[PDB]
Amino acid sequence: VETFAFQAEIAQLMSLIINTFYSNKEIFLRELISNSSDALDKIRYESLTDPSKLDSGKELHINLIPNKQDRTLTIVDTGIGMTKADLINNLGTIAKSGTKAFMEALQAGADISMIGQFGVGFYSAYLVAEKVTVITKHNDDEQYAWESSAGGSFTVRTDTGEPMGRGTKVILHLKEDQTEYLEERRIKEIVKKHSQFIGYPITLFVEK
Ligand SMILES: COc1ccc(-c2c(-c3cc(Cl)c(O)cc3O)noc2NC(C)=O)cc1
Questions:
Q1: For residue 78, what are the domain limits?
Q2: Best CA proximity match to 33, nearest among 130, 147, 122, 149
Q3: Region Interaction with NR3C1: which residues?
Q4: CA 74: distance to chain centroid?
Q5: Annotated binding site
Q6: Cβ(152)–Cβ(6) under 8 Å?
Q7: What is the sign of the dihedral through the CA atoms of 143, 40, 43 and 114?
Q8: b/e sequence 161-175, b meaning 16+ C-beta within 10 Å
Q9: How far apart are CA 199 and CA 40, in angstroms?
Q10: How far is CA 140 from CA 85, 120, 122, in A?
Q11: CB atoms within 10 A of CB 155
Q12: In whole angstroms, what is the distance from residue 10 CA to residue 5 CA?
């Protein structure tokens, strides 16, 4: 297990997300679904010139899976997947600029709901999750698990759990007071409100 420090700017963003009073928490789902769609768009585009890129799975879709016993909401997609470099360095390099822009907008009267316009919507997960685990597999790289509970650090390890073929799974370990996001009616409402036109099937699993 390797432990890394967030860039200071990202840590600051995460603290703002965690600490600011902001009731409209539901936006986290739209932002994660949007990231999944972006990743799906990318593998779809690449497959047009190299069909072999789909050998790791033809189906392009998003699943939403609540688990009350584990207190998790999991978002699974079969998009392009992230590489180790993406996880440790490259996405963070991009996020630094977006974060600066977002922070400036907030000071100028924007609200947290606009976070996605700055490319850093993933961090909105911390509105509702105490811990976030991201399991990801890109073609020709290994399966990785990224994890953070904030506090300025994240971990990356090679993942030895169930192989996913290709894509990303975001596991949200929900805060104790945020279990509404495990309810079918609530998730369904949120998807309809904010994600109705996503161009890939979104299946909302129900609980056993
Ligand atoms: C907005 O920034 C990003 C960055 C990475 C990604 C991404 C993802 C990806 C990332 C997150 Cl956080 C997610 O919730 C879902 C995803 O499928 N998988 O591969 C990716 N690679 C690219 C190039 O799309 C999706 C969005």
A1: 1-208
A2: 122
A3: 1-208
A4: 9
A5: 35, 77, 96, 122
A6: yes
A7: negative
A8: eeebebbbbbbbbbb
A9: 9
A10: 13, 26, 24
A11: 14
A12: 10
* 27 Cβ contact list (under 8 Å, min separation 6): 112, 113, 115, 124, 127, 194
Beta carbons within 8 Å of 20's beta carbon, 6+ residues apart: 112
Q: For residues 191 and 205, what is the distance between their CA atoms, to the nearest angstrom? A: 13
Q: Which residues line ligand 1 (CB under 6 A)?
A: 32, 35-36, 38-39, 42, 77, 79-82, 91, 119, 122, 168, 170
Structural domains counted in the chain? 1
CATH code of 99's domain: 3.30.565.10
Question: What are the structure tokens assigned to 111, written together?
Answer: 């609200």
- What token pair was written down for 191? 């998807």
Distance CA 179, CA 186 (A): 10
Percent helix, strand, coil in the chain, to 5, is 45, 25, 35
